[PDB]
């Protein structure tokens, strides 16, 4: 119902923009790197919950970059880390 592939493309877009635009803000770059790895896992496995975790991580980082809400970068990083752990569980369970 939602073009998840479109949302994942936009997740890569915001993450790579943040990497280039925040050279002296480590929490923003950490969130961006975790989102890029999580998008790769979402495309590898396709699990809807994994995809939703990555999309939410990207939404949080996008808001951090647009509004300057740096504490949302911590939330973005945690959501992307949960996506990676979800992906590792899929690999360990299936």
Q: How big is the chain, counted in residues? A: 94
Task: Record the resolution, in angstroms.
Answer: 1.4
CA distances 70 to 51, 54, 59, 75, 89, Å, are: 23, 18, 13, 9, 29
CA distances 5 to 1, 38, 51, 74, Å, are: 11, 13, 9, 25
Phi, psi at 22, each rounded to 5°: -125, 60
Angle at the Cα of 59 (from 71 to 65), degrees rounded to 5? Answer: 55
Phi, psi at 68, each rounded to 5°: 85, 15
Please state how this structure was obtained: X-ray
Report the Cα–Cα distance between both ends of the chain, in Å, rounded.
26
**Do residues 87 and 48 lie in contact, with contact meaning Cβ atoms separated by under 8 Å?**
no
Domain range annotation of the chain: 4-93
Of the candidates 64, 51, 83, 48, which has an alpha carbon nearest to the alpha carbon of residue 15?
Answer: 64
């Amino acid at each position: 119902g939602e073009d998840y592939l479109k949302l994942l493309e936009e997740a890569l877009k915001i993450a790579r923009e943040v990497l280039e635009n925040y050279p002296l803000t480590p929490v923003m770059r950490a969130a961006a790197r975790a989102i890029i790895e999580a998008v790769k896992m979402a495309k590898k496995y396709g699990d809807e919950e994994l995809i939703k975790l990555v999309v939410e991580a990207a939404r949080l980082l996008r808001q951090a970059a647009k509004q300057g809400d740096l504490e949302l970068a911590r939330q973005a990083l945690a959501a992307a880390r949960q996506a990676l752990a979800f992906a590792r569980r899929v690999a360990g369970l299936e």
